[PDB]
């Protein structure tokens, strides 16, 4: 496959970075097959894109029937009842105070993008506040909202005004909830007025930021100041959504609820679909024709996104996600005594991660974290990187992993840490 590696280097730009050396041929559940027969259990699931697994039999049958019905029709002209079919369901499952309304789009960056458009149309305000280490997409506005410059926005500036970043709460790094809230106070006193901020966008637990959970200390306080200053709270559950946090949405772990929320990735279980759900009054702010997109709500994707929403419940992967999470929680917790480089492990449900620090100084180092990288797939196990420094392994296995599938990779994960 070495010749195809170079066939790509001369046909697709260097900007599309790719981690693993080998290509894909077939995928099942959480097991990937290379071109050369190698079998690797997927602890990545394409970045939380397949909570219900690679090619789950139900929605693969739901996309097959949806195929010979219609593949595309542009919902803006000819609508389909499968669009209203899901908008009904998520409006009943989303943690939004009062009546909820849902619009669907294609990519997750478009969901956060449209949440900004709806937040701006309802508030009439320009301001948008995110947090350091937060990731919200790769388009112009979403890169501005993203809190990691390299490599996400290196060389694509300048970026629009009225967008600033607070500090995300993180007791593991010595920043408290008060430290986080004070950075917001410093933005209101130096950057932009509170009555000029349209929305505060927030990952319930940060995805590419290092799997750091926001405390209920932070959320209830956050809900308070936006209610004071007329700001809308937006929860970005593109990565944390759909049963991986032990519950359907990570915001269900909290008592107060966001006015808007963006969803994608495993929302369709491996097919291009995003969406925005929120309060009926705020979502109804843009005028007709203001929201759209050609591929918005791909009929095959809404059919699968309907399907995972049945695997949601009959398989009950919310309860399983807490059972997978808590055991791998234990595997790395006595590996903590065996492997000294572990400084902390964190996660809710099975959205779990482990941070590794070099012993001489407690600074990160991604090449011990990334020493585990190679040993894992050397054993046929694909683990993804994370963090502001690259020092955190995030475990993104599908929720549909058989238990023998899991314990294999778990004890293989026991061998990567002591070598």
Considering only residues 301 to 340 of the shown chain, the ones binding its own copies according to CB under 8 A are: 301
> Judged by CB, which is closer to its own copies: 103, or 251?
103
Q: How far apart are CA 213 and CA 200, in angstroms?
A: 17
Which of 110-118, 212-220, 328-336, 356-364 is the region at the interface with its own copies (rule: CB under 8 A)?
110-118
Cβ 50 vs Cβ 398: under 8 Å: yes
278: how many CB neighbours lie within 10 A of its CB? 30
Sheet holding 351-356, edge to edge: 342-348, 351-356, 392-395
Cα-atom radius of gyration of the chain, to the nearest Å?
Answer: 21
> Judged by CB, which is closer to its own copies: 75, or 249?
75
Question: Minimum Å distance from CB 340 to its own copies?
Answer: 26
Cα distance between the two ends of the chain: 29
Question: Minimum Å distance from CB 163 to its own copies?
Answer: 7
Q: Does 228 bind its own copies (CB under 8 A)?
A: no
Site map 9..38 versus its own copies, x via CB under 8 A: -xxxxxxxxxxxxxxxxxx----x-xx---
235: left (phi over 0), alpha (psi -120 to 50) or beta: beta
Which one of residues 58, 91, 230, 375 is an interface residue with its own copies (CB under 8 A)? 91
CA nearest 15: which of 164, 151, 201?
151
Q: Does 193 bind its own copies (CB under 8 A)?
A: yes
Cβ 270 vs Cβ 245: under 8 Å: no
- Residues 248-287 close enough to bind its own copies by CB under 8 A: 264-265, 269-272, 280, 283-287
Task: Tell me the torsion sign for CA atoms 154, 155, 156, 157.
Answer: positive
Question: Minimum Å distance from CB 18 to its own copies?
Answer: 5
CA nearest 241: which of 95, 28, 32?
95
Question: Minimum Å distance from CB 410 to its own copies?
Answer: 21
| Tokens read off for 142 | 């979403």
Which of 185-193, 245-253, 326-334, 341-349 is the region at the interface with its own copies (rule: CB under 8 A)?
185-193
Site map 365..404 versus its own copies, x via CB under 8 A: -----------------x-x---x----------------
Q: Does 288 bind its own copies (CB under 8 A)?
A: yes
Cβ 282 vs Cβ 259: under 8 Å: yes
> Judged by CB, which is closer to its own copies: 17, or 37?
17
Site map 42..81 versus its own copies, x via CB under 8 A: --x-xx-xx---xx----x--xx--xxxxxxxxxxxxxxx
Question: Minimum Å distance from CB 268 to its own copies?
Answer: 9
> Judged by CB, which is closer to its own copies: 181, or 388?
388
Which one of residues 295, 329, 370, 379 is an interface residue with its own copies (CB under 8 A)? 295
Nearest 5°: phi and psi at 5?
-55, -40
Q: How far apart are CA 263 and CA 86, in angstroms?
A: 13
Residues 6+ positions from 354 with CB-CB distance below 8 Å: 332, 342, 344, 345, 346, 392, 393, 395
> Judged by CB, which is closer to its own copies: 4, or 313?
4
> Judged by CB, which is closer to its own copies: 26, or 415?
26
Torsion of CA 219, 220, 226, 228, to 10 degrees: -170
Which one of residues 41, 95, 106, 311 is an interface residue with its own copies (CB under 8 A)? 106
- Residues 120-149 close enough to bind its own copies by CB under 8 A: 120-121, 124, 126-127, 131-133, 138-141, 144, 147-149
Q: Does 102 bind its own copies (CB under 8 A)?
A: yes
Nearest 5°: the CA angle 236, 242, 247 is 100
């Amino acid at each position: 496959s070495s010749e195809l590696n170079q066939r790509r280097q001369q046909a697709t730009p260097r900007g599309v970075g790719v981690m693993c050396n080998y290509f894909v041929e077939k995928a099942e559940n959480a097991t990937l097959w290379d071109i050369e027969g190698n079998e690797v259990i997927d602890f990545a699931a394409g970045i939380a894109v397949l909570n219900t697994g690679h090619r789950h039999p139900k929605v693969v049958a739901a996309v097959a029937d949806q195929l010979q019905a219609f593949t595309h029709t542009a919902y803006q002209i000819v609508p389909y009842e499968s669009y209203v079919s899901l908008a009904e369901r998520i409006n009943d499952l989303a943690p939004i105070d009062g009546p909820a309304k849902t619009a669907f789009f294609t990519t997750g960056a478009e969901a956060v993008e449209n949440a900004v458009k709806i937040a701006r149309a309802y508030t009439g305000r320009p301001g948008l506040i995110t947090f350091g280490g937060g990731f919200h997409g790769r388009t112009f506005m979403t890169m501005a909202l993203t809190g990691k410059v390299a490599p996400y926005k290196i060389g694509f500036g300048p970026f629009p005004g009225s967008v600033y970043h607070g500090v995300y709460p993180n007791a593991a790094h010595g920043v408290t909830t008060a430290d986080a809230l004070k950075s917001l106070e410093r933005i209101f006193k130096a950057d932009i007025a509170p009555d000029q901020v349209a929305a505060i966008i927030l990952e319930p637990i940060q995805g590419e930021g290092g799997f750091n959970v926001a405390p209920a200390d932070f959320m209830q306080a956050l809900r308070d100041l936006c209610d004071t200053h007329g700001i809308l709270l937006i929860a970005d559950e593109v990565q944390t959504g759909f049963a991986r946090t032990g519950k359907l949405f990570a915001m269900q772990h909290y008592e107060v609820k966001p006015d808007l929320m963006t969803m994608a990735k495993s929302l369709a279980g491996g097919f291009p679909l995003s969406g925005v759900v929120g309060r009926a009054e705020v979502m109804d702010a843009p005028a007709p024709g203001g929201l759209g997109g050609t591929y918005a709500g791909n009929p095959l994707a809404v059919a699968a996104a309907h399907a995972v929403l049945d695997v949601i419940a009959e398989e009950q992967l919310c309860q399983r996600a807490e059972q997978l999470g808590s055991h791998l929680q234990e595997v790395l917790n006595q590996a903590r005594a065996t492997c000294p480089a572990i400084v902390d492990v964190r996660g809710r449900g099975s959205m779990v991660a482990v941070e590794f620090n070099d012993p001489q100084t407690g600074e990160p180092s991604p090449e011990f974290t990334r020493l585990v990288q190679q040993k894992a797939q050397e054993n046929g196990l694909l683990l993804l990187s994370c963090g502001v420094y690259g020092n955190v392994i995030r475990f993104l296995y599908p929720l549909t992993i058989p238990d023998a599938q899991f314990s294999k990779a778990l004890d293989i994960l026991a061998r990567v840490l002591k070598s």
